[PDB]
Amino acid sequence: MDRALFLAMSGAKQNMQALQLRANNLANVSTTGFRADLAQARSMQAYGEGHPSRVFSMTERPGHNFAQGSVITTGRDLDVTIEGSGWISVLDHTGKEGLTRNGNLKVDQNGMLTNASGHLVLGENDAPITLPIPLSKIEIGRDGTISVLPQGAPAEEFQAVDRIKLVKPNDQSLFKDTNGLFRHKTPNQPYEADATVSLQTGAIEGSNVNAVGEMTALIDLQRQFEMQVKMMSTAEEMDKSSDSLLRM
Amino acid sequence: YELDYYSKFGHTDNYGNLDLRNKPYTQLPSGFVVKGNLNISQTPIKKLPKGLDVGGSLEATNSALKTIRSGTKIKGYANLLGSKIESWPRGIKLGGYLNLTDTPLKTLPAKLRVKGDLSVIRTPISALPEGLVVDGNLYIGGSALQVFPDTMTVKGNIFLGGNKITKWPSNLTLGGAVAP
Amino acid sequence: IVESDKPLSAEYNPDHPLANEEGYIYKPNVNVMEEMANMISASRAYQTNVQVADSSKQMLLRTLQMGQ
């Protein structure tokens, strides 16, 4: 009726969306290699004839928290965590290359090296890494080199077979896709395998969700949500009062 | 007074737009760099520091801006409607228009290039410099101009604004027309 | 419409993409307490002007009925 009902409704609806965005981070505190999503609000003015008094606010995801996660020491050979900044190249079920930070690796019955989510890990050849089937000792190098020991072979047979593809692009050019894999915003952009990133083998990288940061965002989203609801109530209260004009 | 490292921090938004509207500042730090637009309208600033680099637009309407030092770089436009500037220096990197309406401007540097419109409305300027090239419209309404330079390039329409033109350029490539 | 001249509230969000050289991000200078007062004041002022117009509407009607 006054268009301030919808101006406040559109703000209250967006505050719920930001609340859900923060809720996903808290639901994913223990997730491995999880980058917390950032939430903010953007002011978009309604340009047109009349006084510039109506400005909408909509929530967006400007970026992600690319800080180093909490490293968990597991003493497992097939667990690796990226030191500092970096990524691991994996292809999902669609055969589409995407960057990940989950270094919880495993070997299937055929020998292909996958991660906890089943994404095949790429290597030097840019093809999924395949290991000889009857292994005896698998050690992951600090730079990503994979050295294996054939079954029954003596100690002095630690030959390298593959090198884990570690990619360190600009963090501002990466977006989180629909399946948690970060990809270039510009499509058809090759992932250059960096040789500077290092793996801290024997440990797993946790999530970087700042629990306090989400909680203080929640309490501010609640108060701003409630204040706009009062604006909706006072908008209809004014409308009801301004109805006796035609009540002759 | 002057602008310090922390004085400017209180007038900057998330996109580096410096707003000094009616602030009692008289000068800016030497070698000043502003990421975004700079607004110094209605300010007692008399001279811009040398080496000023603006990533946006300049607005100094109704201000005391009188002197600009050479080497200043402006990515956008320079809006000086109603300032106190008397002379325009040579070598200013300007990517927009130069609005000098209601200014005491008298002289302009030779071979000046303006990438947009040029407004010298109500200015005591006596003669446009030879080699002046304007990529937009020309406004000379209410000015003291009565003689045009021999060669000038106005990509837009020249607006006389009332003053009588006694001499026309010999080499003039005009993309528009001439209006009184 | 004229914007308030209060300084923008600077917050230390150094890891934010929009952070400046010092890690500060700036946020609107909206103060909750004064905006709530405007909500109360504008609504009560709006409703009392309807009362005057409604009362003034009656006075015109009684003038029409004057004399008969």
């Binding site: 340009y47 047109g48 004839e49 009349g50 006084h51 510039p52 | 509207r21 975004g36 637009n37 209605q42 990533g55 946006g56 637009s57 990515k75 956008g76 436009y77 990517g95 927009g96 228009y97 609005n99 990438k115 947009g116 419109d117 407004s119 990529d135 937009g136 419209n137 | 419409i1 004229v2 914007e3």
Partner: peptide, 23 residues
């Protein structure tokens, strides 16, 4: 008119020479 009043039109800006130049 009031000084410093906001305008109801997009704010002519920098990128896209189009605005930096046209008055």
């Amino acid at each position: 008119g009031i000084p410093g009043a906001l305008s109801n039109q997009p704010p002519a800006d920098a990128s896209i020479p189009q605005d930096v130049a046209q008055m």
